[PDB]
Structures are given as C-alpha cells and as structure tokens.
Design an enzyme around this catalytic site. Sequence first.
Site, mmCIF file in Angstrom:
data_model
loop_
_atom_site.group_PDB
_atom_site.id
_atom_site.type_symbol
_atom_site.label_atom_id
_atom_site.label_comp_id
_atom_site.label_asym_id
_atom_site.label_seq_id
_atom_site.Cartn_x
_atom_site.Cartn_y
_atom_site.Cartn_z
ATOM 1 N N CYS A 109 0.805 -1.197 0.000
ATOM 2 C CA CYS A 109 0.000 0.000 0.000
ATOM 3 C C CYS A 109 0.856 1.272 0.000
ATOM 4 O O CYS A 109 1.707 1.479 0.864
ATOM 5 C CB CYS A 109 -0.869 -0.032 1.251
ATOM 6 S SG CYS A 109 -2.117 1.239 1.343
ATOM 7 N N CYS A 188 -5.768 -9.804 -3.651
ATOM 8 C CA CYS A 188 -4.609 -9.758 -4.520
ATOM 9 C C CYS A 188 -3.736 -10.996 -4.306
ATOM 10 O O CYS A 188 -2.886 -11.250 -5.172
ATOM 11 C CB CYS A 188 -3.809 -8.479 -4.316
ATOM 12 S SG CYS A 188 -4.669 -7.011 -4.888
#
Length: 205
Positions: A109, A188
């Site tokens: 992130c 993911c």
Amino acid sequence: MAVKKIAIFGATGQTGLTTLAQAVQAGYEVTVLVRDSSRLPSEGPRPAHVVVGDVLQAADVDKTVAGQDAVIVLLGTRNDLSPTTVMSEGARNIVAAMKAHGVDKVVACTSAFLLWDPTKVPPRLQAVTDDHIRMHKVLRESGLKYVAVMPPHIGDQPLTGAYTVTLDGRGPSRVISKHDLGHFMLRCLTTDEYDGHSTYPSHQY
Ligand SMILES: NC(=O)c1ccc[n+]([C@@H]2O[C@H](COP(=O)([O-])OP(=O)(O)OC[C@H]3O[C@@H](n4cnc5c(N)ncnc54)[C@H](OP(=O)(O)O)[C@@H]3O)[C@@H](O)[C@H]2O)c1
C-alpha cells in the site's frame, strides 16, 4: 498453487489490524513483524507467528519473510508527516529478504496520490508521499510480482467486499474503508490480474 503463509508488515496500524484479522479468519497462516506486541489485540483472530522487531533491521525482516508465500505491506507513519525514509527503507529490506528466501509476491500500500496529478498533493503530505514514491520504485524495480495498492482516504466504514478497483485512480469515490482495503489486499493474493499494475480501490458507502 495457492498462497497459504503470509507476512504482514504494518499489522498493528489501522488497515493492518483488520487485514490481519481478516487474513487469519480466511485461513491464512500469518506472521507479523511488530515493534510492540501490546499493539496487537487479544480478542478476535490471532496471528500464527509474531516477530518482535523493526522493519529497518534487515535481520528482523528476514526472520519475518522466511518461509512465506507472499507479503502484504501496510507500513506507514501514523500521524507523523515529517520527512521520512521508513517505508522505503523497510521495503528495501523486504525485497532483499524476499529474494533471499524465494518469496515472489508482494502486495503493498502506498496512496492514490501516486495516480492523481502529482502536482496536486497537499503540502503537508508531500514528505510522506515522496517516501511512498521511493517505496513504489523499490518494489517495481525488484522485478518480483508486485501489486501496487494506491488507495484514497482510508475510512472506518464497515466491510462490504463490494468496492470497485480501477487502474487509473478514477472511480466511484475518494474513500475506501480500512476493512475493504484489507479485503482487497487479500484478494490480490489469489489472482495475478493486478501483478505489475497500480490499483485504486474505492466505494460509495
Ligand atoms: N490515512 C489515509 O487516509 C491514507 C490514504 C491513503 C494511503 N495511506 C497510506 O496507507 C498506508 C497504511 O495506512 P494506515 O493508516 O493503515 O497505517 P498506520 O495506521 O500509519 O500504521 C503504520 C503501520 O506501520 C508500522 N510501522 C511503522 N514504522 C515501523 C517500523 N520501523 N518497523 C515496523 N513497523 C513499522 C506501524 O507500527 P506501530 O503500530 O508499531 O506504530 C503500523 O503497524 C500508509 O502508508 C499511509 O500513508 C493512508
């Protein structure tokens, strides 16, 4: 073959806590690196393995990455907006440990500022953004399978699993719940469709 063992970095942060809880509930065998284990909860799902240490110490990162199938990165600086290399130096260590141990999948992130016009970052967030940019560079150049997750504002709305993921930073809103962001990081792990891409999760709550 599916991911079963993961490391999470930043598991005690706002997104990390819910990502950790979700991952354990989903069946992953989770290892976390934490500086301070008191910041992990007692209630709810619990990681399988806790390493006490610092992402800035290569040996601590190495111990955390050893044996994993994939890595989730949710490092950040909490409310500290000062100039910083913590995330990018942590990422350098993570990449080196992944390569040393044969781990080839990282989902990390940064922020939607890395998709939006780069001249349109609030000044107070520029220093942190500059280190997100350094971290993104480290991960993209690692040549490992890297999913760049670039969220807008992280909210506290409930988990939905119903958010939208775009590749360009445009989408239905400029908010993603922390819970949905964590859910997306986990998604993911079970697709290759975002490897080598930048992703923008958002939702209208
Ligand atoms: N807030 C927003 O709306 C927003 C929007 C888009 C992108 N982001 C970015 O998204 C990412 C995740 O944000 P967040 O709010 O979930 O994170 P956060 O609450 O800031 O948590 C940061 C996590 O990183 C860990 N950490 C920091 N320094 C470390 C070190 N030296 N060694 C090991 N762990 C370390 C912290 O550990 P401790 O618990 O020990 O402090 C914590 O677990 C951040 O990079 C943030 O900038 C935020």
